[PDB]
Amino acid sequence: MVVIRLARGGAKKRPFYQIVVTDSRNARDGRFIERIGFFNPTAQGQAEKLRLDADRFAHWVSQGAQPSERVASLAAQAKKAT
Amino acid sequence: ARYIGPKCKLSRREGTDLQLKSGVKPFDVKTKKANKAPGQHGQARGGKQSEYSLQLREKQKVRRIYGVLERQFSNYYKEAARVKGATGENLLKLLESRLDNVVYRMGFGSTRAEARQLVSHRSITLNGRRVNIASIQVKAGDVIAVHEGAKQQLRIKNAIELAAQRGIPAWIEVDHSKLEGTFKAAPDRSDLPAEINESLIVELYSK
Amino acid sequence: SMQDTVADMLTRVRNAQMAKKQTVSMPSSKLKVAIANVLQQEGYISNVEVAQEETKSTLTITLKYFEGKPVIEMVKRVSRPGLRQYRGKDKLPSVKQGLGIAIVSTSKGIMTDRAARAAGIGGEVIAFVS
Amino acid sequence: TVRTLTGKVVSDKMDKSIVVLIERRVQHPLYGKSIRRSTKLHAHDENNVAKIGDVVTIKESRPISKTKAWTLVEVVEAA
Amino acid sequence: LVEKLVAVDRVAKVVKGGRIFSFTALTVVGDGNGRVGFGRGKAREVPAAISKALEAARRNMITVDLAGTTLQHPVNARHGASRVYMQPASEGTGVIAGGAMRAVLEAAGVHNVLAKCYGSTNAANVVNATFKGLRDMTSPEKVAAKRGKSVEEIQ
Amino acid sequence: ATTNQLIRKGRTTLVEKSKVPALKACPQRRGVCTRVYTTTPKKPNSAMRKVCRVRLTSGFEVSSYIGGEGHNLQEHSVVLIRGGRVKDLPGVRYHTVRGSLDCAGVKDRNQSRSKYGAKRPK
RNA sequence: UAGUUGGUGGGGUAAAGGCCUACCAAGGCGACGAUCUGUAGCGGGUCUGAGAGGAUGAUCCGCCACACUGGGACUGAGACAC
RNA sequence: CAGAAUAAGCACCGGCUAACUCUGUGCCAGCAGCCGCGGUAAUACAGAGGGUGCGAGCGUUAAUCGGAUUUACUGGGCGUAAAGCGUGCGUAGGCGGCUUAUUAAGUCGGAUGUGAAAUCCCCGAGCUUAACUUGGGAAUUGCAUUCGAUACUGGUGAGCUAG
Ligand SMILES: NCCC[C@H](N)CC(=O)NCCC[C@H](N)CC(=O)NCCC[C@H](N)CC(=O)N[C@@H]1[C@H](O)[C@@H](OC(N)=O)[C@@H](CO)O[C@H]1NC1=N[C@@H]2C(=O)NC[C@@H](O)[C@H]2N1
């Protein structure tokens, strides 16, 4: 089914995740439908830690996408921050 | 790597003082072989030189003054050419913005080699952190200071005493009492000595 | 046979200038008349006349000389029947950094390259003049 | 909102089918001289209206046979 | 007047009993602010050949109208089988040219230019072609005067 | 050529041939010394040049030059050959790497040792 | 090139279609290169070059194909299935 | 915390190309990318001294583009350097005189959609700096649809006489 999950980028021991909407059967870092934000667990200084597009997130959730547990937690955090 | 060896023969080959020694005694009295090349086949400065020889000998002088090797110097040239403005001015600003050069021009190091030794041994703090890289570029407004453990060192007092004799540079504002200075802005080409013909290095690398 | 009358006109003008003639005449057509008018407006020639005696019509151009040299130092056909050249508004050629003129046929008439750039249109590049 | 083409009929022998020859003028990719290119399309003619030499319009449709995927719309000019 | 020595060559002439050798020198002189010239000299010794070449170069001079320290417009020129192309450049470019072109351009006072040789690279012919191109290069004032327009009209 | 001729027939490009075909685009090749002998140079040179005939893994049978002074090669030795022309020995287009497989490094040298494969004396 | 090109009746498929079959017609492709033959996974890209071009298709991403060599089907939403 | 204590090699010096002498050998031994060195004073072979260029690397071989305007579209040639068929006629094709009306295929302009991400470039951000990672842009010079323009080329109709 359609899921919203994290795709791992960045470098060794400093991961940087893209939040993507994709078919669950695709490879983790491969084909995806839409990119709707990013997550940087080790951000510091002026670096932005989390960015999520709430409009597209809600649109895909209404269309039937299933967020992963981490993405759901990040969406809750973003809603709390905003 | 890093060049270790005799300093004065480099000055003799280049034909000019390269500030490699501290400067307690003049270069002429220090070497007694100035005006001659370091080789057994060495001649005076009046010998004929090709354009390639002139271009090469100009770049080597700057490299020997600043202690920079060929790969890092080429990277500096590429960065200067990428950045808009006079390429030679950008290259000289890049050389003067190095942390080890800035410490030497602050006067905590009697020689750029001594300043580099201090920076490597973490005797100097940039902003508020103990860095150990000599090639770190110093930006406008940065604050350079001496670590407390490194304070009270006879080499540092000797270096600041010699820096008092040397001309204090305009672009750096340094208090010697607490041993701390501020980099205000990049030096200008007019502020820099005029014996350097950076255009020769430019034509060398542009080929 | 004769298959490029514009090139014939340019060649006649060039040879007359090289031979120091004051006047050059040829069979006339509306395209050559338009090109001659553009040259006169740009100042490369003095006067353009058309004599219509009968079904035949003759075009006459008065040439200009300045300090012992012809005003037109270079005239070159660019588009030819064997290879036509069309350019957009962003690729119109510049003749020796704007000191010359490229004659361009556009949907709004025959004009110079800078006029075509100002009007924001392209067309067929007929000739380079300098 | 359908893709149409205009061409000349060069064959009408087979049942309910015509062969239309389309022509286009393009620039050579390297030498820049405009050249002529031609493609042959099989169309469907339900009533065999079209004839050899006419100028016809055809439009894209679902496949009708192995080689036919275009249908005749009208005869612009008759031979 | 800066003086540059483009080339020195040894030439031979055959007589009974052996060969007579001589030297030829090609020189370019220039003020560096729009005046340049070139010449050749032949003598049995290099100093005399160079002196004759310099004297001929001083007798053969022209005046060049530069746009600042660069060319007014791109130039194509040729002398015999040597063809040269020169093009204006922006500040900081320098003189990107071979030795023979470089002598003439530096003597004439060009500081930024991109240049190229096609065909033969014989020094005398290359110098001839560059010299002719520099002589024949024009300026907006001359163009406006010859067309009867104004400089702003010429654009 | 006219534009129409260029459209009808293009511009042909002549392919180039490798000067070292026995290597088959490899940097080096293994071989077995079929012969070890000596040849004479062409004019105006005169010397006694040391050459070997080697059968390569590529399938070719070529001749290679032995550089330096003094070599231990004999027939049935296993050697490594690289590119390089002598230009005074006709038909010799390859060199033998000193010190690789059975070739020994040249002795009594202390300058340019990396060529000829001489280790650093203590 | 003789299911070959088109048409009709029928079959068949999730679905258009000579995909299959029985009849009818003689059609269809080709110097704008058919047929045959050599080589080759394709693209985003990479290297070089002032540019135009030339060379290339590791590592990353998309598509395709294959699974000791050939021919098949079953189950299943989906395979002719490492 | 203890102690300078554990840490420097490789190629080259005839010209192209920065860096020169002495011994040994005498067309031998050998060097060599090209031109070329060696036959008793070898700056070109081998060693040494000195120097030059790089530096945890330094050289060689292989391979691609460049220099090569040396397949020339940009951007070459054919009297004698390589290059005009022995000469005509003619098929396909390429190109084609002047005026006028019309068409809008070529040509030009606008709008919309698309041209995945990564990569290249620019301004920032985080790595002690840099490599590297990353935000946003710019770019993707293309394709398609639709609406316009009519000078030139093409199509169609009419007319003309310099071919
Ligand atoms: N050659 C010997 C001929 C012997 C022959 N058997 C004689 C014969 O049989 N019958 C006699 C018939 C003679 C004929 N009708 C007249 C004639 O020849 N016209 C043409 C020659 C013009 C004039 N005469 C020579 C001339 O002006 N030279 C100058 C000169 O050298 C020099 O400038 C000065 N100022 O010194 C140089 C710049 O440095 O520019 C040259 N100019 C050029 N260089 C360029 C180049 O090569 N190509 C293209 C173009 O750009 C050229 N222009």
Domain chopping of chain A, boundaries: 1-82
Would you tell me which CATH number, out of the four given (3.30.160.20, 3.30.70.1280, 3.40.720.10, 2.60.120.10), belongs to the domain E2-62?
3.30.160.20
Antiparallel, parallel or unpaired: β B143-146 and F28-39: unpaired
Asked if the peptide bond before residue C93 counts as cis, ω within 30 degrees of 0, the response is no
The encoded tokens of residue B28 equal 């002429």
**Quick check: B169 and B105 in contact, CB under 8 A?**
yes
* Cα–Cα distance, A73 to A82 (Å, whole number): 14
Q: Assess contact for E77 and E133: CB atoms under 8 A.
A: yes
Q: Which two tokens stand for residue E62?
A: 């022209």
Residue with tokens 């009270």: B152
> What six digits make up the tokens of B99?
């942390």
CA of D21 to C1' of H21 (A): 87
Residue located via tokens 């820049």: D32
Query: CATH: 3.40.50.300, 3.30.450.20, 3.30.230.10, 3.40.50.2300. Which one for E63-147?
Result: 3.30.230.10
Q: Which of F48, F97, F106 is nearest to F72 (CA)?
A: F106
Cβ contact C42–E147 (<8 Å): yes
Domain boundaries, chain E: 2-62, 63-147
E141 phi and psi angles, rounded to 5 deg: -65, -45
CB contact at 8 A, E1 and E31: yes
Q: What is the DSSP string of F54-101?
A: EEETTS-EEEEE--SS-----TT-EEEEEE---SSSTT--EEEPTTSS
Is D32 within 8 Å of chain C by CB?
A: yes
State both tokens at B26. 């003049």
CB E88 within 8 A of CB E10: no
Domains and CATH numbers, chain B: 7-95+192-206 (1.10.1050.10), 96-183 (3.10.290.10)
Nucleotides of H under 7 A from a protein CB: 8-12, 16-21, 27-39, 46-56, 58-64, 69, 71-73, 76-77, 93-100, 105-110, 116-117, 122, 125-130, 132-135, 145, 148-153, 160-163
Non-local (6+) Cβ contacts of B186 within 8 A are B93, B96, B97, B140, B171
Q: Are E104 and E36 in contact (CB under 8 A)?
A: yes
Nearest residue to F92 (alpha-carbon basis) of F44, F38, F31:
F38
| Ligand 1 center–CA E133 separation, angstroms | 15
Deposited experimental method:
cryo-EM
Q: At what angle do helices B198-206 and B51-66 cross, to 10 degrees?
A: 110
The residue assigned the tokens 């015509």 is: D18
Residues of C within 8 A of F2 (CB-CB) are: 82
**Tokens linked to D36:** 């002529």
The CA distance from F92 to F23, in Å, is 14
Distance between start and end Cα atoms, chain B: 27
Q: Give the mutation target among E132, E135, E136, E137 for probing the ligand 1 site: most ligand atoms within 8 A of CB.
A: E132
Name all chains with 3 or more CB-CB pairs below 8 Å to chain D: C, F
Residues of chain D by 3-state class (helix, strand, coil), percent to 5: 0, 60, 40
Determine if strand G comes within 7 Å of the CB of D63: yes
Q: What are phi and psi of F23, to 5 degrees?
A: -75, -25
Report the candidate in E63, E148, F92 with the shortest Cα–Cα distance to residue C45.
E148
* DSSP state letters, chain B: ----S-SHHHHHHHTS----S-SSS-HHHHHS-TTS-SSTT---TTS---HHHHHHHHHHHHHHHHT--HHHHHHHHHHHHHSSS-HHHHHHHHHHTBHHHHHHHHTS-SSHHHHHHHHHTT-EEETTB----TTPBPPTT-EEEE-TTTSS-HHHHHHHHHHHHSPPPSSEEEETTTTEEEE-SPPPTTTS-TT--HHHHHHHHH-
| Residues B153/B68/B137/B170 CA torsion (nearest 10 deg) | 70
The b-or-e profile of B39-65 (16+ CB within 10 A means b, else e) is: eeeeeeeeeeeeeeeebeebbbbbbbb
Q: What is the DSSP letter of F22?
A: G
Q: Is residue F6 helix, strand or coil?
A: helix
Domain residue ranges in chain C = 1-72, 73-130
Cα of E79 from ligand 1 centre, angstroms: 9
* Inter-residue long-range contacts of B115-120, CB under 8 Å, 24+ positions, other chains counted: B116/B67, B118/B150
- Torsions phi, psi of C15, nearest 5? -65, -40
Q: Do E63-147 and E2-62 fall under one CATH topology?
A: no
Distance between CA atoms of residues C124 and C126, nearest Å: 6
Tokens describing residue A39: 């997550």
User: Of B113, B120, B149, whose CA–CA distance to B134 is shortest?
Assistant: B120
Query: Is the minimum CB–CB distance between F3 and chain C shorter than 8 Å?
Result: yes
Quick check: E2 and E30 in contact, CB under 8 A?
yes
Chain F: closest CA distance from residue C48 (Å) = 35
Distance from CA of C83 to the nearest CA of D (A): 6
